[PDB]
């Protein structure tokens, strides 16, 4: 009667409602591509500014969670600020009670549970966002953990998101099938960002400007985003390619 | 005065080879006045024997407390509880009431059915598991018991050497202590057979 | 809204009748037979399992005989999951009564208590009822053996011989026909297997679908010993009554 | 907030609870998993699957350790398995381990996980779990023991069993290969072999996860010098080990 | 026990001993009383030892979150966090913290919080219980706006006097230097000032 | 399939859209027009306040309420509900000011109100907001300006509008950053805040109105939110009358 | 109760006495005093005898949780920060003074924690009633950079200082040596001083010496059925 | 459809229908007319009895010694709000030594009405109050909607056939403000105003209830023989 | 430590007349050997023809007087401008006193 409107199982054993969350993570229309270097991890995203009046600086989709862990969000921006907020609150809470900085492995599990709990109570709406968590662990190496609206997560060599992500996934696939290694090899992080931009220029069929990009890199013990001035510099190095 | 010396009571426990024995007095006083010469301080859940010293009322409260917990153990896992497993439950029940605790001092004595080893253990007020393979003594004539018991005892005894040692140990502290004595019961716990032997002794 | 999505499980129909209660008894007919026969020296409790397989261990499955306390056992008919919740509540409720009065709980008292919890959910809170029906085999000094069935509604009525679960109609009428008051446990065993042979939903009455238990006064020192039989003793007694 | 305090697990008119049946539907969509109980071990096996080949399955756990003697394996929902493994760990320690000083028997832990199933049919605002677990384990009193916990909330002890999408084929193959006496090396030889008639993707040790609860190890205990304690009887096998034994089928 | 902090041209330099007596028996003598509560805002602990550390953990939890959501805290901000925990459990939590730190916009600042919990800004602070012997030394020979070399001697020379006159002050003198150049630890062993 | 997807708001329709929250945008359209010019110096708010009859009292009612001492909050849509969102941040800011002893940043505030308006879209027990607020101010991180949709979404802006005249206002601010490429002081920007409200009263030329203008600027009021009044205001009005003739 | 915890170049070695007291009377000649949070996080405890055993068992519980929830080794800090926090709430009504030691992937550690929530770090700490004595021996023989074979001797002579001169301490001396990325070795009853002489005679007795009033046999068995 | 029996659900036309229906509670209530000046505000209320033996329903409720509210909606709902206004008037006097401002008292009022229109099982209050009062800013007349929207007016009316009173006041608007220091006339201009809402209901000594507030007068309610010199 | 009650002295004398009443009290306000103020009332009008004085310790005096002038107000409000008797004022005052009986008031109150 009703079962596509709350969070109880259908005759087929499926949760239609949970299925709509995966068709609501594509409304932004933003593509992201995230690759693991030797000692660095890189995430590049599109950033669009619809109008004149809007200022791009504030328009973001790369939110800094820990001080080592960033999170790049595809899908609607309300569910992104709430998801950022909780994840951030937890990250602090872990430091407080166990006295070290949070493993990414655990924040991916932690948020997976909370995601799930929203499909497990009827009132609470689950959050329609795919979060990609980028880090450089101090025990677990460079990693990417991606959560999704079911409250599932799995690790990645590399990953892509957005609506046009089929194209992107295949490009990524070829590079590691050909190579037969699970991560990009190169010690300088500047060039892992470079490799990344090319693979996105080919996959999406477009060249870019500095404002169409917003680039975040996690090195060891810190997360930062590159300014737009610095991003132009990354774009010149593709003519040297 | 002391909340654990206002009715007295003692428990002695000894191991032997292939046997244990435990024993208590039968005195319930209210201070100076003797009220009863037939109150037990030993109880038995299954083939485990739990002797409980200290304040009068908490002996009894605590007996019906473990009566409750032993029933649920046996029902779920379909066997009588072992001595070693039980000792952990005696510790936790004391510790739950960490503040304003049960003013007792129990003694666990058994012989494991899964290994055939004599096994004994003790507790204070708050309950710290006191391993031994000698003997554990507890109560208000415990200062006397610790000296007396050690002196006669030879490491390992036969099942009926063990009746002569733990009987004398108990008698001689109990007639040099004012809140102990007054009739006493000594148990010899073998593999499968427990005999309860009351003792002829001084009533004055 | 949240008012929309409410089932309303605690309303009277226009007939005066509780939908969820009628359905609870309905679903207990899918679950296996359970029989109890009250002798004048013990009680025989015998139940036919709701599922059997050729890969299943059939020698530690408990889904029919469960001990609530030392001298009171149940036979189960309904879903076992539902029964497991109430079974740990009963085990507690019994064990409490022993704790405070230092005497083991009367059979009357323990059975009215289970019915009251069940009644409660159909009475208030908007929660489904538990679809379980128990036959209690139990002893006390007060009237000796008592046999009792309670239902998911929460009412208990005494019985001399009773059946709940699968083929209810078939078993109860047959039981009236063979009933005498001169039976003793030997006879009571034999009739309980014989009624199950008639209700059997399989090829023959086989050991591997039986749980079987008794509470006997022939047990030593003038006291009830509850004996839950192993399947190797069920297999022995199945030759004794001559079915196989 | 909350404003739901009424069940959404309800009886149908011809009897049978509708919701516990639907939940059991979601299980037979999922992966194929098996457990074979031998005389000296229990072996469990499951098949690992990923979004994409760029997803690793070496950082995902479809076999978990609950206590050092009792492991788990599932067929059903990944998300439901995740929460139900954690709540079991938490209740294993808090409702017995503190109090009784040792880890729970296999039966006793099974019994506890069955009430969690029950409270997601009962109590307002919740729907049932959508996993059937095998919980294999070892305790000192039941020997080695195999149980199958289901969304219904009931458990059944087995001799060997299957759950998942290949369940019907699996159990017909398992009927003919269970023997009264099974050695631990023979048990592994049946369990890989059954799972192989239920695979149609890649067959490698990186896609087949196998874990034994064989006999004990004083090398994964982390210490020596207490002879009371004998280490984990649970021992998950890495991809390489499983792979040698695939070439030896 | 003696704790201090002094403002100077390039920022603020913090200073501590390392003896923690309880009774007549010195529990620890290499105590590191200088705690990082952010990454450019360090504090100094004195008083009831468990009750200062407990508070500091909570302040750390507050500032780690403050950074992650709202942006980097200031000396002012951190001190405020500190105050309001001492102030609202002021009967049982007994804490004297000197919160010192280098802002990139206001330079070094010092706050002193005594046991009631009231903030007070100061151009150098002293709190403790070994700092009642060096009160008159610290005021006469101190100058506001000293160059770097001078500052490091000013805090050494005071603690040398504190060591001398107070027996609950001793061991190593630890200094942490907070500047725009960064975060630099110096350590001075006893012969190096007992020489003077 | 099925019937509904508009009875509750912790449903999601299949497209990937919401409801109720999608419908709540139409509710904000029924409101009046309200603008914000983010100046270099600060921000200048202005709001069209309708005068229905002469029965009402002029310059005695407001849609510009202060939050903290340095943040204008000015709103359109359903006015009691918009006042509840203003009420909420007065509470929020006072707690922050207690806790951390500094005037609450605009970027902090932007996060805080955002989470709350998001929060009502996650239960079916409460109604989604059917107002949009345009808020900003001057704190020590520079001048900032924000618009917060009832969707729970907010962005940076340097010019905002909402309500009926959001088409003409959005377009006329496009013109305003394209007149001035190096920007303009807040003193001049009072006069444009008047002009584009009068141009967004041609969508409401069945009515007559009184204009409220307010400013928070670093150096015209020392970073403090006040009302523009008196002689400076009457000059903004005269400029705007000439501009529409 | 003398408990040393001595850090060394490749690890940490923590050793304790085997005496458990209850008042002036020696409860147990031999009892364990080193307990196991985690297989790589050992601890010994001094202060109140029950509250040593339970608080170790309890933060023991939550770390074992936590190590398995993270799929990684449980760190020394993880333990330390929970202990600390837990003890402060009761405001020093739970009497425990633990030497906490251990190795982890991020090196060798050694901590001490007071009953409220002070925590200190040296390369050698001691708590107990023996603390004073223990500590004296260490400061003379100890240097930076000690080998294993060196370390263990320093730990043993340190507890023996404890035994001679402290009366809360006695009997055997237990050791547990931990090195980084090697198994943690428990050498219970490493060094035995004070070995009990032969008693002057036997105090065994012929049969029948004591007097029985009555006898019975009482049943521990379940009711049977013939 | 079900948008109309749920106070938590919109409405594809961008409304809520419940507040609207609640606004119709005011139309079926009785008529009242308020008019104010700079020194005196006045409420002139038409009470309305049920039948011949029934009493007449009081429609001016004393809120304080300088504040009064009058209902025009439904009476039971008005009894929840009347207390609330009294409660915040005594709290303002008690704590801050302040005779609670009229304008600020409106703003409290808003948020009590809003929080039940946001919440399910709740309802908007069906009553709509006209609230007079005399503070240091002078006299004021507030019109409180069931919406929770408050507005400040020289004179207005709500009830049944309210539009005709608004007209009498829209004309005579510039007469009564410049009346100051003469409460006698201010009372007289509202009698004529509520007479345009009649339909042969007349005004007697049992129908008319006036209450005034001054700079030299507290709160007073006239009724009986005290409104019989102002028919 | 803390001590929670003082005394601020002064004296009252209530004389019930035969057709009149008089309630007098000195207005001297002191603390210890200090004179706080020459003049500061200890007789307050409550209106509705009842005078009240609570003399003793000032801080209670101000609050219990205050809580009486609201019980006057609320009486007029909900019993609809009925007259409040001296006799009904008394009974009412007794509950105000008694409401705190474990941290009690400190004033002798005469009406």
From Swiss-Prot, chain B:
Q: Which UniProt keywords apply?
A: Cytoplasm, Isopeptide bond, Nucleus, Phosphoprotein, Proteasome, Ubl conjugation
Its function, per the record, reads: Non-catalytic component of the proteasome which degrades poly-ubiquitinated proteins in the cytoplasm and in the nucleus. It is essential for the regulated turnover of proteins and for the removal of misfolded proteins. The proteasome is a multicatalytic proteinase complex that is characterized by its ability to cleave peptides with Arg, Phe, Tyr, Leu, and Glu adjacent to the leaving group at neutral or slightly basic pH. It has an ATP-dependent proteolytic activity. This subunit may participate in the trypsin-like activity of the enzyme complex.
Q: Does the keyword Phosphoprotein apply?
A: yes
- Full protein name: Proteasome subunit beta type-3
Q: Name one GO biological process term.
A: proteasomal ubiquitin-independent protein catabolic process
Membership in a protein family = Belongs to the peptidase T1B family.
Residues modified as Phosphoserine are 30
For this record, an example GO cellular component is: cytosol
Task: Name the Gene Ontology molecular function terms of this record.
Answer: endopeptidase activator activity
Give compartment(s).
Cytoplasm; Nucleus
UniProt lists the gene as PUP3
Q: Whom does it interact with, and what assembly results?
A: The 26S proteasome consists of a 20S proteasome core and two 19S regulatory subunits. The 20S proteasome core is composed of 28 subunits that are arranged in four stacked rings, resulting in a barrel-shaped structure. The two end rings are each formed by seven alpha subunits, and the two central rings are each formed by seven beta subunits. The catalytic chamber with the active sites is on the inside of the barrel.
**Chain residue numbers at which the record places covalent cross-link Glycyl lysine isopeptide (Lys-Gly) (interchain with G-Cter in ubiquitin):** 69
**Keyword presence, Transmembrane:** no
From Swiss-Prot, chain E:
PROSITE patterns attached here? Answer: PROTEASOME_BETA_1, PROTEASOME_BETA_2
Q: Name one GO cellular component term.
A: nucleus
Q: Please give the chief subcellular localization of this protein.
A: cytoplasm
Q: What is its EC number?
A: 3.4.25.1
Query: Which Cys residues form disulphide pairs?
Result: none
One Pfam family, short name: Proteasome
Sorted alphabetically, the Gene Ontology BP terms of this entry are: proteasomal ubiquitin-independent protein catabolic process; proteasome-mediated ubiquitin-dependent protein catabolic process
Instruction: Quote the subcellular location field of this record.
Output: Cytoplasm; Nucleus
Q: Which reaction does it catalyse?
A: Cleavage of peptide bonds with very broad specificity
Annotated GO molecular function terms are:
endopeptidase activity; threonine-type endopeptidase activity
Q: Which residue positions are annotated as catalytic? A: 1 (nucleophile)
> Keywords assigned by UniProt?
Acetylation, Cytoplasm, Hydrolase, Nucleus, Protease, Proteasome, Threonine protease, Zymogen
Other notes: The side chain of Thr-1 acts as a nucleophile, and the N-terminal amino group acts as a proton acceptor.
Family of this protein:
Belongs to the peptidase T1B family.
Q: What does this protein do?
A: The proteasome degrades poly-ubiquitinated proteins in the cytoplasm and in the nucleus. It is essential for the regulated turnover of proteins and for the removal of misfolded proteins. The proteasome is a multicatalytic proteinase complex that is characterized by its ability to cleave peptides with Arg, Phe, Tyr, Leu, and Glu adjacent to the leaving group at neutral or slightly basic pH. It has an ATP-dependent proteolytic activity. PRE3 and PRE4 are necessary for the peptidyl-glutamyl-peptide-hydrolyzing activity. This subunit is necessary for the peptidylglutamyl-peptide hydrolyzing activity.
User: What is the protein name for this chain?
Assistant: Proteasome subunit beta type-1
From Swiss-Prot, chain F:
Keyword match Nucleus: yes
Q: State what this protein does.
A: The proteasome degrades poly-ubiquitinated proteins in the cytoplasm and in the nucleus. It is essential for the regulated turnover of proteins and for the removal of misfolded proteins. The proteasome is a multicatalytic proteinase complex that is characterized by its ability to cleave peptides with Arg, Phe, Tyr, Leu, and Glu adjacent to the leaving group at neutral or slightly basic pH. It has an ATP-dependent proteolytic activity.
Instruction: Offer one example of a GO biological process linked to this entry.
Output: proteasome-mediated ubiquitin-dependent protein catabolic process
Family annotation (Pfam families): Proteasome, Proteasome_A_N
Instruction: Give the similarity note.
Output: Belongs to the peptidase T1A family.
Instruction: Provide the assembly information.
Output: The 26S proteasome consists of a 20S proteasome core and two 19S regulatory subunits. The 20S proteasome core is composed of 28 subunits that are arranged in four stacked rings, resulting in a barrel-shaped structure. The two end rings are each formed by seven alpha subunits, and the two central rings are each formed by seven beta subunits. The catalytic chamber with the active sites is on the inside of the barrel.
UniProt-annotated location(s): Cytoplasm; Nucleus
Question: Mind telling me which GO cellular component terms the entry cites?
Answer: nucleus; proteasome complex; proteasome core complex, alpha-subunit complex; proteasome storage granule
Its PTM note reads: The alpha and beta forms are probably products of the same gene with different post-translational modifications.
SMART domains in the record, alphabetically? Proteasome_A_N
Q: Which domain of life is it from?
A: Eukaryota
UniProtKB/Swiss-Prot annotation, chain H:
Where do we see the Glycyl lysine isopeptide (Lys-Gly) (interchain with G-Cter in ubiquitin) cross-link in this protein? Answer: 188
Q: Per UniProt, what is one Pfam family of this protein? A: Proteasome_A_N
- State any GO CC term: proteasome complex
Q: Where in the cell is it found?
A: Cytoplasm; Nucleus
For this chain, the annotated S-S bridges are none
Check the record and name the SMART domains matching this protein: Proteasome_A_N
> Does this UniProt record's set of keywords contain Glycoprotein?
no
Phosphoserine PTM positions: 11
**SUPFAM superfamilies to which the protein is assigned, alphabetical:** N-terminal nucleophile aminohydrolases (Ntn hydrolases)
Instruction: Write down the PROSITE patterns for this protein, in alphabetical order.
Output: PROTEASOME_ALPHA_1 (PS00388), PROTEASOME_ALPHA_2 (PS51475)
Its BP terms in the Gene Ontology are: proteasomal ubiquitin-independent protein catabolic process; proteasome-mediated ubiquitin-dependent protein catabolic process
The answer to whether keyword Cytoplasm applies is: yes
| Keyword entries, A-Z | Cytoplasm, Isopeptide bond, Nucleus, Phosphoprotein, Proteasome, Ubl conjugation
Q: What does this protein do?
A: The proteasome degrades poly-ubiquitinated proteins in the cytoplasm and in the nucleus. It is essential for the regulated turnover of proteins and for the removal of misfolded proteins. The proteasome is a multicatalytic proteinase complex that is characterized by its ability to cleave peptides with Arg, Phe, Tyr, Leu, and Glu adjacent to the leaving group at neutral or slightly basic pH. It has an ATP-dependent proteolytic activity.
Q: Which family does it belong to?
A: Belongs to the peptidase T1A family.
Any miscellaneous information on file? Answer: Present with 7210 molecules/cell in log phase SD medium.
Protein name from the UniProt record: Proteasome subunit alpha type-6
Q: Which organism is it from?
A: Saccharomyces cerevisiae (strain ATCC 204508 / S288c)
């Amino acid at each position: 009667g009703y079962d596509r409107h709350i969070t109880i199982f259908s005759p087929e054993g499926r949760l239609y409602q949970v299925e709509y969350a995966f068709k609501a993570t594509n409304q932004t229309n933003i593509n992201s591509l995230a690759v693991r270097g030797k000692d660095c991890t890189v995430v590049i995203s599109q950033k669009k500014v619809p109008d004149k009046l809007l200022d791009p600086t504030t328009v973001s989709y790369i939110f800094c969670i820990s001080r080592t862990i960033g999170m790049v969000v595809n899908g609607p921006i309300p569910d992104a600020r709430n998801a950022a907020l909780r994840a951030k609150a937890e990250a602090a809470e872990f430091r407080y009670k166990y006295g070290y900085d949070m493993p990414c492995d655990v924040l991916a599990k932690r948020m997976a549970n909370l995601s799930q709990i929203y499909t497990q109570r009827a009132y609470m709406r689950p959050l329609g966002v795919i979060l990609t968590f980028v880090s450089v662990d101090e025990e677990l190496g460079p990693s990417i953990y991606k959560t999704d609206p079911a409250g599932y997560y799995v690790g990645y060599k590399a990953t892509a998101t957005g609506p046009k992500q089929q194209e992107i996934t295949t490009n990524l696939e070829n590079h590691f099938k050909k190579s037969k290694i699970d991560h990009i090899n190169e010690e300088s992080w500047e060039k892992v960002v470079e490799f990344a931009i090319t693979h996105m220029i080919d996959a999406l069929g477009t060249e870019f400007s500095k404002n169409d990009l917003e680039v975040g890199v996690a090195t060891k013990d810190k997360f930062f985003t590159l300014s737009a001035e610095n991003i132009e510099e990354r774009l010149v190095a593709i003519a040297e390619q | 005065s002391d909340p654990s010396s206002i009715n007295g009571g003692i428990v002695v426990a000894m191991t032997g080879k292939d046997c244990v024995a435990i024993a208590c007095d039968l005195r319930l006083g209210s201070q100076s006045l003797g009220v009863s010469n037939k109150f037990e301080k030993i109880f038995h859940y299954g083939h485990v024997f739990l002797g409980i010293t200290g304040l009068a009322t908490d002996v009894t409260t605590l007996n019906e407390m473990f009566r409750y917990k032993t029933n649920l153990y046996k029902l779920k896992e379909e066997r009588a509880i072992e001595p070693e497993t039980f000792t952990q439950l005696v510790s936790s029940s004391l510790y739950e009431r960490r503040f304003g605790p049960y003013f007792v001092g129990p003694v666990v004595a058994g012989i494991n059915s899964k290994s055939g080893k004599p096994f004994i253990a003790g507790f204070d007020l708050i309950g710290c598991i006191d391993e031994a393979k000698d003997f554990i003594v507890s109560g208000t004539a415990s200062d006397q018991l610790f000296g007396m018991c050690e002196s006669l005892y030879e490491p390992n005894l036969e099942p009926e050497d063990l009746f002569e040692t733990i009987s004398q140990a108990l008698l001689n502290a109990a007639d040099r202590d004012a809140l102990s004595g007054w009739g006493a019961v000594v148990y010899i716990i073998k593999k499968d057979e427990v005999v309860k032997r009351y003792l002829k002794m001084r009533q004055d | 809204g949240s008012r929309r999505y409410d089932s309303r499980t605690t309303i009277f129909s226009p007939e005066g009748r509780l939908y969820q209660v009628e359905y609870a008894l309905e679903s207990i007919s899918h679950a296996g037979t359970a029989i109890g026969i009250m002798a004048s020296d013990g009680i025989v409790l015998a139940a036919e399992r709701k599922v059997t397989s050729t890969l299943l261990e059939q020698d530690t499955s408990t889904e029919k005989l469960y001990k609530l306390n030392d001298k009171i056992a149940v036979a189960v008919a309904g879903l076992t999951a539902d029964a497991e919740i109430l079974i740990n509540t009963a085990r507690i409720h019994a064990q409490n009564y022993l704790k405070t009065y230092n005497e083991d709980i009367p059979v009357e008292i323990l059975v009215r208590r289970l019915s009251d919890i069940k009644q409660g959910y159909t009475q208030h809170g908007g929660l489904r009822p538990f679809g379980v029906s128990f036959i209690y085999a139990g002893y006390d000094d007060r009237y000796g053996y008592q046999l009792y069935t309670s239902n998911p509604s929460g009412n208990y009525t005494g019985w001399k011989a009773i059946s709940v679960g699968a083929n209810t109609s078939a078993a109860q009428t047959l039981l009236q026909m063979d009933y005498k008051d001169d039976m003793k446990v030997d006879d009571a065993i034999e009739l309980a297997l014989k009624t199950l042979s008639k209700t059997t939903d399989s090829s023959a009455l086989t050991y591997d679908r039986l749980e079987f238990a008794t509470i006997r006064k022939g047990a030593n020192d003038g006291e009830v010993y509850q004996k839950i039989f192993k399947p190797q003793e069920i297999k022995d007694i199945l030759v004794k009554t001559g079915i196989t | 907030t909350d404003r739901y305090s009424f069940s959404l697990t309800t009886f149908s008119p011809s009897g049978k609870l509708g919701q516990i049946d639907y939940a059991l539907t979601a299980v037979k969509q999922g992966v194929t998993s098996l457990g074979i109980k031998a005389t000296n071990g229990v072996v469990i096996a499951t098949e690992k699957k990923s979004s994409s080949p760029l997803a690793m399955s070496e950082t995902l756990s479809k076999v978990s350790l609950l206590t050092p003697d009792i492991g788990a394996v599932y067929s059903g929902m990944g998300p439901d398995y995740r929460v139900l493994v954690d709540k079991s760990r938490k209740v294993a320690h808090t409702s017995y381990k503190r109090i009784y000083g040792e880890y729970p028997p296999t039966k006793l832990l099974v019994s506890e996980v069955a009430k969690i199933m029950q409270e997601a049919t009962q109590s307002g605002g919740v729907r049932p779990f959508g996993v059937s677990l095998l919980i294999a384990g070892h305790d000192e009193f039941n020997g080695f023991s195999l149980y199958q916990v289901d969304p219904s909330g009931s458990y059944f002890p087995w001799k060997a069993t299957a759950i998942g999408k290949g369940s019907v084929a699996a159990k017909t193959f398992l009927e003919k290969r269970w023997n009264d006496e099974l050695e631990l090396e023979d048990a592994i030889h049946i369990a890989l072999l059954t799972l192989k008639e239920s695979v149609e993707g890649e067959f490698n040790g990186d896609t087949i996860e196998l874990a034994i609860i064989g006999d004990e190890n004083p090398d994964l205990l982390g210490y020596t010098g207490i002879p009371t304690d004998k280490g984990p009887r649970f021992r998950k096998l890495t991809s390489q080990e499983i792979n040698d034994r695939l070439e030896a089928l | 026990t003696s704790i201090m902090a002094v403002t100077f041209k390039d920022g603020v330099i913090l200073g501590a001993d390392s003896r923690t007596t309880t009774g007549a028996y010195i529990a620890n003598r290499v105590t590191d009383k200088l705690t990082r509560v952010h990454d450019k805002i360090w504090c100094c602990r004195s008083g009831s030892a468990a009750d200062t550390q407990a508070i500091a953990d909570i302040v750390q939890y507050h500032l780690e979150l403050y950074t992650s959501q709202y942006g980097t805290p200031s000396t002012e901000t951190a001190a405020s966090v500190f105050k309001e925990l001492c102030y609202e459990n002021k009967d049982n939590l007994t804490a004297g913290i000197i919160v010192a730190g280098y802002d990139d916009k206001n330079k070094g600042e010092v706050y002193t919080i005594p046991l009631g919990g009231s903030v007070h800004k100061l151009p150098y602070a002293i709190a403790g219980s070994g700092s009642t012997f060096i009160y008159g030394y610290c005021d006469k020979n101190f100058r506001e706006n000293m160059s770097k070399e001078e500052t490091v001697d000013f805090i050494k020379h005071s603690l040398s006097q504190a060591i001398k006159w107070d027996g609950s002050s001793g061991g190593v003198i630890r200094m942490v230097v907070l500047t725009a150049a960064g975060v630099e630890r110096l350590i001075f062993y006893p012969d190096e000032y007992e020489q003077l | 399939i099925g019937t509904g997807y508009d009875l509750s708001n912790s449903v999601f329709s299949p497209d990937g859209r919401n409801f109720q929250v999608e419908y709540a945008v139409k509710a904000v359209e029924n409101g009046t027009t309200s603008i914000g010019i983010k100046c270099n110096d600060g921000v200048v708010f202005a709001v069209e306040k309708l005068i229905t009859s002469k029965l009402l009292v002029p310059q005695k009612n407001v849609k510009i309420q202060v939050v903290d001492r340095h943040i204008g909050c000015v709103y359109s849509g359903l006015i009691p509900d918009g006042r509840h969102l203003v009420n909420r941040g007065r509470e929020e800011a006072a707690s922050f000011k207690k806790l951390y002893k500094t005037p609450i940043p605009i970027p902090a505030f932007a996060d805080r109100l955002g989470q709350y308006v998001q929060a009502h879209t996650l239960y079916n027990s409460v109604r989604p907001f059917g107002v949009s607020t345009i808020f900003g101010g001057v704190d020590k991180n520079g001048a900032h300006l924000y618009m917060l949709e009832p969707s729970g979404s907010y962005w940076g802006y340097k010019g905002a509008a909402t309500g009926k005249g959001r088409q003409s206002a959005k377009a006329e601010l496009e013109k305003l950053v394209d007149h001035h490429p190096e920007g303009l002081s807040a003193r001049e920007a009072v006069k444009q805040a008047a002009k584009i409200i009068y141009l967004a009263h041609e969508d409401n030329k069945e009515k007559d109105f009184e204009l409220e203008i307010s400013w928070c600027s670093l150096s015209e009021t020392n970073g403090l939110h006040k009302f523009v009044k008196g002689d400076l205001l009457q000059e903004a009005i005269d400029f705007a009358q000439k501009e529409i003739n | 109760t003398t408990i040393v915890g001595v850090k060394f170049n490749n690890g940490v070695v923590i050793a304790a006495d085997t005496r458990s007291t209850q008042g002036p009377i020696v409860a147990d000649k031999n009892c364990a005093k080193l307990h196991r949070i985690s297989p790589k996080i050992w601890c010994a405890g001094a202060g109140t005898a029950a509250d040593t055993e339970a608080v170790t068992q309890l933060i023991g519980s939550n770390i074992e949780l936590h190590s398995l929830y993270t799929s990684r080794e449980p760190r020394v800090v993880s333990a330390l920060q929970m202990l600390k926090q837990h003890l402060f709430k009761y405001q020093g009504h739970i009497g425990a003074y633990l030497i906490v030691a251990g190795v982890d992937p991020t090196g060798s550690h050694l901590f001490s924690i007071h009953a409220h929530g002070s925590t200190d770090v040296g390369y050698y700490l001691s708590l107990g009633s023996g603390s004073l004595a223990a500590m004296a021996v260490l400061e003379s023989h100890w240097k930076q950079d000690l080998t294993k074979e060196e370390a263990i001797k320093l730990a043993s002579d340190a507890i023996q200082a404890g035994i001679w001169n402290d009366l809360g301490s006695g009997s055997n001396v237990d050791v547990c040596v931990m090195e980084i990325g090697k198994d943690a070795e428990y050498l219970r009853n490493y060094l035995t001083p004070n070995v009990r002489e032969e008693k002057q005679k036997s105090y065994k007795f012929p049969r029948g010496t004591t007097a029985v009033l009555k006898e019975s046999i009482v049943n521990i068995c379940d009711i049977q059925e013939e | 459809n079900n948008y109309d029996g749920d106070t938590v659900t919109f409405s594809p036309t961008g409304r809520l229908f419940q507040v609207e229906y609640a606004l119709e509670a005011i139309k079926q209530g009785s008529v009242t007319v308020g008019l104010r000046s700079n020194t005196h505000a006045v409420l002139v209320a038409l009470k309305r009895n049920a039948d011949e033996l029934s009493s007449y329903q009081k429609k001016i409720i004393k809120c304080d010694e300088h504040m009064g509210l009058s209902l025009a909606g439904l009476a039971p709902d008005a009894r929840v709000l009347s207390n609330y206004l009294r409660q915040q008037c005594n709290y303002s006097s008690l704590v801050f030594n302040r005779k609670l401002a009229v304008e600020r008292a409106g703003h409290l009022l808003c948020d009590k009405a809003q929080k039940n229109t946001q919440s399910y099982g709740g309802r908007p209050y069906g009553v709509g109050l006209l609230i007079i009062g005399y503070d240091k800013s002078g006299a004021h007349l507030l019109e409180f909607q069931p919406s929770g929207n408050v507005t400040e007016l020289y004179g207005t009316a709500i009830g049944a056939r309210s539009q005709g009173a608004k007209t009498y006041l829209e004309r005579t608007l510039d007469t009564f403000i410049k009346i100051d220091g003469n409460p006698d006339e201010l009372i007289k201009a509202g009698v004529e105003a509520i007479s345009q809402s009649l339909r042969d209901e007349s005004l007697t000594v049992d129908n008319l209830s006036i209450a005034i507030v001054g700079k030299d007068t507290p709160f007073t309610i006239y009724d009986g023989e005290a409104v019989a010199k102002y028919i | 430590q803390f001590n929670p009650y003082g005394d601020n002295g002064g004296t009252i004398l209530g004389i019930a007349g035969e057709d009149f009443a008089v309630l007098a009290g000195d207005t001297r306000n002191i603390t210890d050997y200090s004179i706080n103020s020459r003049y500061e009332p200890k007789v307050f009008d409550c209106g509705d023809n009842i005078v009240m004085s609570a003399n003793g310790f000032a801080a209670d005096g101000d609050a219990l007087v205050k809580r009486f002038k609201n019980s006057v107000k609320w009486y007029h409000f909900d019993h609809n401008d009925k007259k409040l008797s001296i006799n009904s004022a008394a009974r009412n005052i007794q509950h105000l006193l008694y409401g705190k009986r474990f941290f009690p008031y400190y004033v002798h109150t005469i009406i």
